[PDB]
Amino acid sequence: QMDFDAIIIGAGFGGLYSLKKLRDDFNLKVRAFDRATEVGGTWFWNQYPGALSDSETHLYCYSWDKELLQEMEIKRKYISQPDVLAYLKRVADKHDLRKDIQFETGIRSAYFDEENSFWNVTTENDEKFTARFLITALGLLAAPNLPKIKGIETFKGELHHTSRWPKDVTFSGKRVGVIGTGSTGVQVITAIASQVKHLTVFQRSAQYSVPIGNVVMSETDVAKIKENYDQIWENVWNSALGYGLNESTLPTMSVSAEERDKIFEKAWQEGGGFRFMFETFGDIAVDETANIEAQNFIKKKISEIVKDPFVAKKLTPTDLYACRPLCDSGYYEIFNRDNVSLEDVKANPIVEIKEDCVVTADGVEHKLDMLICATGFDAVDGSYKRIDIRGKDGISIKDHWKDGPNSYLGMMVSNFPNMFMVFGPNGPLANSPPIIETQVRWIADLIGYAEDHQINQIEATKDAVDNWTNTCSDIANKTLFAKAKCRIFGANVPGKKNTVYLYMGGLKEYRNQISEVSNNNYKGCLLKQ
Numbered sequence: 001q002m003d004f005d006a007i008i009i010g011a012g013f014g015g016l017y018s019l020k021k022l023r024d025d026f027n028l029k030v031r032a033f034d035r036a037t038e039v040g041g042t043w044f045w046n047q048y049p050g051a052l053s054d055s056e057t058h059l060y061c062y063s064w065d066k067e068l069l070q071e072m073e074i075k076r077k078y079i080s081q082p083d084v085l086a087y088l089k090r091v092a093d094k095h096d097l098r099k100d101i102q103f104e105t106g107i108r109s110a111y112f113d114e115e116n117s118f119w120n121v122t123t124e125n126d127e128k129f130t131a132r133f134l135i136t137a138l139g140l141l142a143a144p145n146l147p148k149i150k151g152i153e154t155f156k157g158e159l160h161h162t163s164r165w166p167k168d169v170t171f172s173g174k175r176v177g178v179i180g181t182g183s184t185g186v187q188v189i190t191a192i193a194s195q196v197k198h199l200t201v202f203q204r205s206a207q208y209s210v211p212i213g214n215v216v217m218s219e220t221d222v223a224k225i226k227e228n229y230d231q232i233w234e235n236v237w238n239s240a241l242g243y244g245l246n247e248s249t250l251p252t253m254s255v256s257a258e259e260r261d262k263i264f265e266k267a268w269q270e271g272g273g274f275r276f277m278f279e280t281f282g283d284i285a286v287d288e289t290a291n292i293e294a295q296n297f298i299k300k301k302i303s304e305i306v307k308d309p310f311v312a313k314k315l316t317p318t319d320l321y322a323c324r325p326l327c328d329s330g331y332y333e334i335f336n337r338d339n340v341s342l343e344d345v346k347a348n349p350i351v352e353i354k355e356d357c358v359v360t361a362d363g364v365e366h367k368l369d370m371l372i373c374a375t376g377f378d379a380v381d382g383s384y385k386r387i388d389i390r391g392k393d394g395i396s397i398k399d400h401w402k403d404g405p406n407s408y409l410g411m412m413v414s415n416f417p418n419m420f421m422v423f424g425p426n427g428p429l430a431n432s433p434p435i436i437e438t439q440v441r442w443i444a445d446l447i448g449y450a451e452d453h454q455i456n457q458i459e460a461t462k463d464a465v466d467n468w469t470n471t472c473s474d475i476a477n478k479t480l481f482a483k484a485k486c487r488i489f490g491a492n493v494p495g496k497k498n499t500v501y502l503y504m505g506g507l508k509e510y511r512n513q514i515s516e517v518s519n520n521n522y523k524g525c526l527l528k529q
């Protein structure tokens with residue numbers, strides 16, 4: 001009666017595993033869609049200079065295919081964007097995935113049918129499809145947050161947002177400006193500084209960055225990893241972050257200053273943001289005195305690398321909370337270069353943009369041939385609201401989430417039956433591929449349980465969703481996060497919203513949580529026959 005058992009939106013990490021698991025392991029008839037012309041998700045769209053993974057190469061991948069784990073290329077310690085794209089293309093090749101992906105096809109609307117209990121999916125070309133279940137693997141790539149700057153539309157030079165980075169960009173002889181110093185801006189600035197006539201960095205808020213330590217991987221090291229891949233993945237599932245770290249329980253202020261400086265320095269040499277934050281000590285994100293110790297080590301490193309003390313001052317975070325640092329391949333070193341200028345657009349904001357320059361509040365005209373906007377995106381739920389998703393009683397996801405996202409286990413939304421989110425909001429804070437695998441296998445097991453027991457409508461209750469929001473709030477309020485403003489709580493509603501964007505108990509406890517549900521006849525889920 002319906003076109004498919006399941007429809008998947010997205011052909012990235014999440015969508016490709018959702019397709020493989022439902023079609024080949026559970027034998028469902030499924031069609032996937034993506035606006036892209038190729039698989040990859042964020043790794044097909046984000047081809048900006050310096051794009052690099054946050055987790056090491058041997059862990060930023062799938063674990064469910066052992067043959068592929070052995071054949072995988074481990075070139076450098078972290079993996080660049082074109083290599084992630086080539087890997088995901090290889091996954092699609094090996095498992096015959098593309099024949100059930102409709103490319104160059106965006107989904108405009110998905111309407112649930114409380115009669116007959118399936119979903120009505122319309123593409124932007126007015127193609128209509130029906131399916132019992134809807135799998136949303138949308139990521140967080142929509143939509144580009146561009147700087148709201150007076151006159152930015154009059155700029156006659158090259159203007160790119162890092163998410164829409166065009167090929168064939170050349171840098172020599174050009175005066176280039178970069179707005180934004182987050183992870184993307186740090187990666188772009190570090191990669192292009194040596195290639196331009198002059199680089200201006202327009203930073204609104206300095207952030208802490210630690211070295212990434214991206215080194216080439218020896219053939220012995222690669223063989224060492226593959227020989228022990230089963231234990232490596234077992235460590236991922238029994239950890240909180242899934243980054244292959246020895247997650248410390250050691251209190252920061254329980255060692256001498258000599259010892260503390262040695263522990264921070266060892267992680268600094270090795271590289272890695274989460275390593276510096278969670279392999280050194282166990283309370284950096286929970287205790288303020290511990291946090292200040294981590295910051296002071298990075299501030300000290302900034303003041304040593306950056307030789308001009310006034311540029312180092314400008315680069316030093318004033319916030320006072322190292323609530324997750326970035327990673328870089330030589331970011332602070334860039335600012336010793338004679339062709340790099342740092343503009344504190346907090347104490348000197350960009351007021352307007354003319355045809356050939358960026359004007360700051362001090363009147364200075366910063367002449368530019370190129371303006372790179374590394375300015376971020378919408379919130380996590382932004383990708384969901386940009387689709388017309390109507391569930392029970394015809395309520396839209398825009399309205400149900402007008403105050404921020406909320407869900408059950410990060411995978412189910414009340415008033416939206418038969419819809420299952422992959423890497424959606426209210427999920428765990430950990431490495432993405434292990435999270436995506438955990439969710440795809442749990443969702444497929446639920447769909448298989450429904451195909452047997454002949455149930456055709458699965459729905460989370462308002463109580464369970466609120467129980468999940470409580471659990472996240474209880475855990476997140478134990479930490480320093482929010483107070484550093486990391487946009488994990490985005491609430492502020494008169495009757496308290498406390499929409500908690502992340503479950504922060506770790507990947508191991510997250511698998512514990514959703515296992516309680518699956519074991520206990522899916523408590524919190526409305527089953528209908």
Ligand SMILES: Cc1cc2nc3c(=O)[nH]c(=O)nc-3n(C[C@H](O)[C@H](O)[C@H](O)COP(=O)(O)OP(=O)(O)OC[C@H]3O[C@@H](n4cnc5c(N)ncnc54)[C@H](O)[C@@H]3O)c2cc1C
Binds near residue numbers: 035108
């Ligand atoms: C440079 C970079 C490095 C990163 N490194 C790490 C890391 O080391 N560790 C980590 O955990 N995370 C990392 N991330 C985060 C990253 O988003 C996740 O790791 C992962 O790629 C998310 O995969 P996904 O399939 O869930 O979403 P995506 O890769 O974003 O795929 C979403 C796809 O759904 C499509 N789509 C959306 N909406 C619609 C619609 N209405 N119709 C049709 N199609 C649609 C999109 O076009 C997109 O192709 C990194 C991100 C970037 C940009």
Ligand SMILES: NC(=O)c1ccc[n+]([C@@H]2O[C@H](COP(=O)([O-])OP(=O)(O)OC[C@H]3O[C@@H](n4cnc5c(N)ncnc54)[C@H](OP(=O)(O)O)[C@@H]3O)[C@@H](O)[C@H]2O)c1
Binds near residue numbers: 053182205377
């Ligand atoms: N794993 C990785 O290595 C990696 C790589 C890329 C992205 N990500 C993730 O994907 C998300 C996006 O990363 P992102 O770096 O592109 O965006 P981002 O983290 O949100 O940072 C955006 C930067 O642009 C600045 N900015 C925004 N609007 C501005 C304005 N109007 N004027 C001046 N400055 C402005 C911001 O300054 P303010 O802070 O002052 O607002 C900020 O420094 C992040 O959450 C990140 O975790 C991860």
